[PDB]
Each structure stands twice: as structure tokens, then as C-alpha cells.
Write an enzyme that holds these catalytic residues in place. Sequence first.
Site, mmCIF file in Angstrom:
data_model
loop_
_atom_site.group_PDB
_atom_site.id
_atom_site.type_symbol
_atom_site.label_atom_id
_atom_site.label_comp_id
_atom_site.label_asym_id
_atom_site.label_seq_id
_atom_site.Cartn_x
_atom_site.Cartn_y
_atom_site.Cartn_z
ATOM 1 C CG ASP A 46 -0.245 0.041 2.537
ATOM 2 O OD1 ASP A 46 1.000 0.166 2.570
ATOM 3 O OD2 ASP A 46 -0.935 -0.026 3.569
ATOM 4 C CB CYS A 49 5.666 0.179 0.678
ATOM 5 S SG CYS A 49 6.262 1.333 -0.596
ATOM 6 C CG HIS A 159 7.020 -2.433 -3.031
ATOM 7 N ND1 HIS A 159 6.069 -2.069 -2.099
ATOM 8 C CD2 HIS A 159 7.559 -3.592 -2.586
ATOM 9 C CE1 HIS A 159 6.035 -2.971 -1.134
ATOM 10 N NE2 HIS A 159 6.961 -3.883 -1.382
#
EC number: 3.4.19.12
Lengths: 166, 76
Positions: A46, A49, A159
Site C-alpha cells: 500500500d 511501504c 515499491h
Amino acid sequence: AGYNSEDEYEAAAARIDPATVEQQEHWFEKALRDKKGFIIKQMKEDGACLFRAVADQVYGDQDMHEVVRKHCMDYLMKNADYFSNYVTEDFTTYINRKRKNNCHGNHIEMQAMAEMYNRPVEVYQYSTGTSAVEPINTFHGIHQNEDEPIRVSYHRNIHYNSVVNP
Amino acid sequence: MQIFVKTLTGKTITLEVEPSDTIENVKAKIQDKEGIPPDQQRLIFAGKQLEDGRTLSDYNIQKESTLHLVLRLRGG
């Protein structure tokens, strides 16, 4: 629109193969074990991170992401005289956004967390060009750290996971 | 003329540039000095983002001005 980091959003959307990724990640993880004895720990993907990975590094669990995000934003406010010259928005407007739990972290926040915890933040990233795995960046304050570096890894350029020394 | 680039990563980089140099050129000089790839570089002057295709003169960047460098590292 008008976000500090607006110029990253589209190029991230364009970039973005589950199979090629999957393979690169075996190799990343292997080289990390093999050369540094580090392990990759999966953080929820989400908007939190970055703060999840720091929370895992600092407190041992990514469920402390809201505390890390809060502390990081308080620190940035208290050091606004410095950090606001690197942000092209109104500073309070920037931090208001960045306080929200789904707002993606970026370089500004990584620098602040390094200083705030007095622990260098090492960023690891897979390269198809070498199997080397030296940090791509190490962010730090000026004080002598008593705790180990905070280590995160940056995946698909979008990410963050946690890099553990087990 | 000399300008300075103060990086968020802590470095002050001195550059020799001309008013007609593009922001594209300036990022290339920073790659030469620091090894940072241009597509990673965001450059700022006095709170304003600089665009690759514009010149130093367009921004009224004068001798001994300071620019700021941030890296593109957004992640979610």
C-alpha cells in the site's frame, strides 16, 4: 497536480511482466544472501511501504508505519528551514499530504528519517547489469550512529521492502 | 561562470557553466562529477523546478547562484 514529485508519477505509470520480475527477484535475493547475508522481508504494497520498511527496521514490525510516518513528518516540520529549499510546493501543504497514510514516501522522507533516527538509510536495488549489491545510496545525518543502518530495497522503481541482517 | 549545486545527499558541487547552457547540460555536468544519472536528477532554483529544455538565463540564474538537487525515489 502541483506535487513536489509530480515529474515521477507518469514515468512510473509507464514502466509497469510478472515472470521477468519474478526471475530478477530470485537473483537479487540470491546475490544478497550470497554476498551480504541479507534477507528480503516483504512489506505490504500500500502507499505506506517506505514507512513499513523503516518500521520493520526500527521497531521490528511494519504495523508501526503510522508512528514512523508521523515522526518523520514532525521532524521535517521542525527542520523546515533546511528541507523546504528542496520542495517546490508550499511546505505545510507538502507535509499535510505526506502525513496521509496512503501517500508514497520519497527521497525527502528518507533523508529526514536517517537524521531523525541517527541511523544511515541504505537503499538496495537490483541491477540487470551486474550481480553486485552495494547500496545505490546511503543517506545520513552528521551524528555518530550507535545503531546499525536502516536498510531498504527498492523494487520495480515503485515499491520498498525491508532488508534484514539475520 | 561558477554555480553551486547543493545536493540533498549532502554535497556541494561547483560547476562551470554559461548562461546559454540548458538544464539538460547541467545534469550532464553533474553526471560527470558525481555519477548521478540525469533521469534521476531534479533541479530546483529558489523553490522552482527547472526544466531540461530551458537555459540558465531563462531562470535568471546568475554567477555564484545555488541550485538544489533531489533524487527521484518515490515508492509505495
